[PDB]
Design a protein around this motif. Sequence first.
Motif, short mmCIF file in Angstrom:
data_model
loop_
_atom_site.label_atom_id
_atom_site.label_comp_id
_atom_site.label_asym_id
_atom_site.label_seq_id
_atom_site.Cartn_x
_atom_site.Cartn_y
_atom_site.Cartn_z
N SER A 59 0.80 -1.23 0.00
CA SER A 59 0.00 0.00 0.00
C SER A 59 0.85 1.29 0.00
O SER A 59 1.76 1.44 0.82
CB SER A 59 -1.03 0.00 1.14
N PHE A 65 -0.02 5.20 0.24
CA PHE A 65 -0.98 6.26 0.63
C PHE A 65 -0.35 7.58 1.16
O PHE A 65 0.86 7.65 1.40
CB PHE A 65 -1.97 5.70 1.67
N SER A 66 -1.19 8.62 1.34
CA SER A 66 -0.82 9.96 1.80
C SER A 66 -1.40 10.27 3.21
O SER A 66 -2.56 9.95 3.46
CB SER A 66 -1.29 11.00 0.79
N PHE A 67 -0.59 10.88 4.11
CA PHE A 67 -0.96 11.26 5.48
C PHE A 67 -0.01 12.32 5.98
O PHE A 67 1.20 12.15 5.87
CB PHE A 67 -0.97 10.04 6.43
N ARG A 69 -9.71 3.37 13.38
CA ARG A 69 -9.48 2.20 12.54
C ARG A 69 -8.05 1.70 12.77
O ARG A 69 -7.10 2.15 12.14
CB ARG A 69 -9.78 2.53 11.06
N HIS A 111 -4.88 -0.70 12.68
CA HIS A 111 -4.22 -1.67 11.79
C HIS A 111 -3.37 -2.59 12.67
O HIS A 111 -2.62 -2.13 13.52
CB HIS A 111 -3.42 -0.99 10.68
N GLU A 120 4.57 -3.77 10.67
CA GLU A 120 4.72 -3.15 9.35
C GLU A 120 5.91 -2.22 9.31
O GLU A 120 6.20 -1.53 10.29
CB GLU A 120 3.46 -2.37 8.96
N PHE A 151 7.55 0.92 6.96
CA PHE A 151 7.20 1.93 5.95
C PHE A 151 8.32 2.91 5.65
O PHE A 151 9.07 3.28 6.56
CB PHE A 151 6.02 2.81 6.44
N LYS A 173 6.77 -0.34 12.89
CA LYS A 173 5.69 -0.30 13.87
C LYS A 173 4.92 -1.61 14.04
O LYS A 173 4.68 -2.32 13.07
CB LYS A 173 4.71 0.85 13.56
N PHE A 193 0.32 8.42 13.46
CA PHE A 193 0.12 7.22 12.64
C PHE A 193 0.32 5.91 13.41
O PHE A 193 -0.34 4.92 13.09
CB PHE A 193 1.06 7.26 11.43
N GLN A 231 -0.67 5.21 16.27
CA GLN A 231 -1.91 5.00 17.01
C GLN A 231 -1.66 4.64 18.49
O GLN A 231 -2.59 4.19 19.19
CB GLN A 231 -2.80 3.92 16.33
N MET A 272 -8.06 10.34 13.10
CA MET A 272 -6.62 10.37 12.80
C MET A 272 -6.20 11.75 12.26
O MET A 272 -5.12 12.24 12.60
CB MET A 272 -6.24 9.26 11.82
F1 LIG Z 1 -4.87 3.56 2.54
C1 LIG Z 1 -4.22 3.09 3.62
C2 LIG Z 1 -3.59 1.85 3.58
N1 LIG Z 1 -2.96 1.41 4.66
C3 LIG Z 1 -2.91 2.14 5.77
C4 LIG Z 1 -2.19 1.61 6.94
C5 LIG Z 1 -1.43 0.48 6.99
N2 LIG Z 1 -0.93 0.32 8.25
C6 LIG Z 1 -1.35 1.35 9.07
N3 LIG Z 1 -1.13 1.63 10.34
C7 LIG Z 1 -1.65 2.69 10.92
C8 LIG Z 1 -2.45 3.58 10.21
CL1 LIG Z 1 -3.12 4.97 10.99
C9 LIG Z 1 -2.71 3.33 8.87
C10 LIG Z 1 -2.15 2.20 8.29
N4 LIG Z 1 -3.50 3.33 5.85
C11 LIG Z 1 -4.15 3.83 4.81
N5 LIG Z 1 -4.76 5.07 4.89
C12 LIG Z 1 -5.05 5.65 6.21
C13 LIG Z 1 -3.85 6.48 6.66
C14 LIG Z 1 -4.28 7.07 8.00
C15 LIG Z 1 -5.64 7.83 7.96
C16 LIG Z 1 -6.27 7.92 6.57
C17 LIG Z 1 -5.16 8.50 5.69
C18 LIG Z 1 -3.84 7.68 5.71
C19 LIG Z 1 -6.38 6.46 6.12
C20 LIG Z 1 -7.43 5.77 6.96
N6 LIG Z 1 -7.28 5.33 8.23
N7 LIG Z 1 -8.40 4.80 8.58
N8 LIG Z 1 -9.23 4.89 7.60
N9 LIG Z 1 -8.66 5.48 6.61
#
Ligand SMILES: Fc1cnc(-c2c[nH]c3ncc(Cl)cc23)nc1N[C@H]1[C@H]2CC[C@H](CC2)[C@@H]1c1nnn[nH]1
Length: 161
Positions: free
Chosen positions: A1, A3-5, A35, A37, A41, A43, A56, A84, A86, A111
């Motif tokens: 994966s 993604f942007s954060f 949510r 995870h 992992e 990253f 993490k 991130f 959590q 988040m």
């Molecule tokens: F696309 C994603 C694919 N994977 C992850 C992910 C993998 N391991 C993780 N461990 C902790 C967290 Cl925090 C996320 C992750 N996170 C993604 N997006 C997150 C991410 C955080 C919140 C927004 C925008 C980006 C988004 C989301 N979090 N909850 N719902 N959507």
Amino acid sequence: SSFSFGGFTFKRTSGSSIKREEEVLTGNLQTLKIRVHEGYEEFTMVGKRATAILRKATRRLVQLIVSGKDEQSIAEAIIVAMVFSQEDCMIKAVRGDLNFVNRANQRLNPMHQLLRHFQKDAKVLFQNWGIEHIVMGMVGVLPDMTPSTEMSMRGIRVSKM
Ligand SMILES: Fc1cnc(-c2c[nH]c3ncc(Cl)cc23)nc1N[C@H]1[C@H]2CC[C@H](CC2)[C@@H]1c1nnn[nH]1
């Protein structure tokens, strides 16, 4: 994966994770539904002024090696990583007056609200994260962002660009 954060591009290099909707209590004993995870992992965090390698476990930051433009750029990357992760101590660092999270979601997700909160002032976060005794090329960083060779914020290391 990929993604942007918090202005950073996250790319997973190792591990896997399943999601679980969970309830968390802030330092103000406010309930947030997040949510979570689950799983170890690893990253890469790539931003415009900082890059980091994040290791993490479920709701725990194992290690964060940060490289950036300056102290502010690195502190920014550090905050994103801690939000991130959590981690409980990050969540428990949400305390005070007005320091609450709007529960109707709307503009931002929990988040994104936690992030917007610690970006304003990271003092409580860094100070409530913990410190640990500390390798050449990698220095430690204290909660006030001072580079040290004897102590660092738990799991946090600052590498030269
Ligand atoms: F696309 C994603 C694919 N994977 C992850 C992910 C993998 N391991 C993780 N461990 C902790 C967290 Cl925090 C996320 C992750 N996170 C993604 N997006 C997150 C991410 C955080 C919140 C927004 C925008 C980006 C988004 C989301 N979090 N909850 N719902 N959507």
